[PDB]
Amino acid sequence: SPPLCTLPPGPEPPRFVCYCEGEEDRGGFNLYVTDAAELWSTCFTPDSLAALKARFGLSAADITPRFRAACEQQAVALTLQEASLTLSGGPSALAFDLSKVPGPEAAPRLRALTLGLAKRVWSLERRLAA
Amino acid sequence: SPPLCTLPPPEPPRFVCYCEGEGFNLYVTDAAELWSTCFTPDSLAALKARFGLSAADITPRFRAACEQQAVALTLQEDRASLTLSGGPSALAFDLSKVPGPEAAPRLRALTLGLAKRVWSLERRLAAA
């Protein structure tokens, strides 16, 4: 269950999805945001992630649990200009710079994201019969 | 002209963000309750540490994000956060709720001050 959430909150139609990967054969960590046209990412490097785990609480030894938190808790603000993402679930507030992922990389990610979500919905409702 | 802005960005305004002055704080209010950074010299220095170049102003960068409609805000539970999305990196500020007795004179002064500023601005725009 990789965490995610949509925006805006509540009734209205969803305009953005925020999600992340991956801490686990483990990948480095990133947040993603898409309007299902374009895709923005933290595009972290080891140093830049470390320097953000600097500016706030954590040791370099996961952020997933805290993003999972703000998702579960609908606690995510977002702002784009020619982007930034804020997690307000937890004790301190975290701010993330996000930049555009180039098309050739973004397209396959979006495609895979769509198919994956479809599989997850099927599987979730099967596990709702329980 | 101490910078400020209101959100949400033509719908009716529901919050005002502002700051003073340079000890420095950011403030946010719905004109009923008031949230603040509640800085001390050390805590502000330490935030100008955690990011931010030299500990030697933030006003210009808050002024920036105001002018540029670039301010996100989240409230809950006598806790809030304010995010400036102007510059090299996005800045986040934890704000806590100011108790009523401490907030009232600040809200009172804010209101009167804004009134005086509107009068004197239109005087200086009656110019052109």
Numbering used by the authors:
A (entry chain B): 5 to 28, 33 to 69, 71 to 91, 94 to 141
B (entry chain A): 5 to 13, 15 to 27, 36 to 69, 71 to 142
Q: Anything the authors wrote about it?
A:
Here we perform systematic interactome analyses of human NHEJ factors and identify a novel XRCC4-like protein named paralogue of XRCC4 and XLF (PAXX). The crystal structure study reveals that PAXX forms a homodimer through its N-terminal domain that is structurally similar to XRCC4 and XLF.
Immunoblotting of the Ku80-associated complex further validated this finding. The space groups for both data sets were P6522, with two molecules in each asymmetric unit. Compared with XLF, PAXX showed more structural similarities to XRCC4. In XRCC4 and PAXX, the angle between the head domain and H3 is only ~45° due to a lack of tension. Structurally, the N-terminal domain of PAXX is more similar to that of XRCC4, as both exhibit a 45° angle between the head domain and the helix stalk. In addition, compared with XRCC4 and XLF, PAXX has a much shorter coiled-coil stalk. The extended stalk of XRCC4 is required for Lig4 binding, implicating that the N-terminal domain of PAXX may lack the ability to bind Lig4. We generated a combined mutation (Nmut: L96D, L98D, L105D and L109D) in this region of PAXX, which is expected to disrupt the hydrophobic interface.
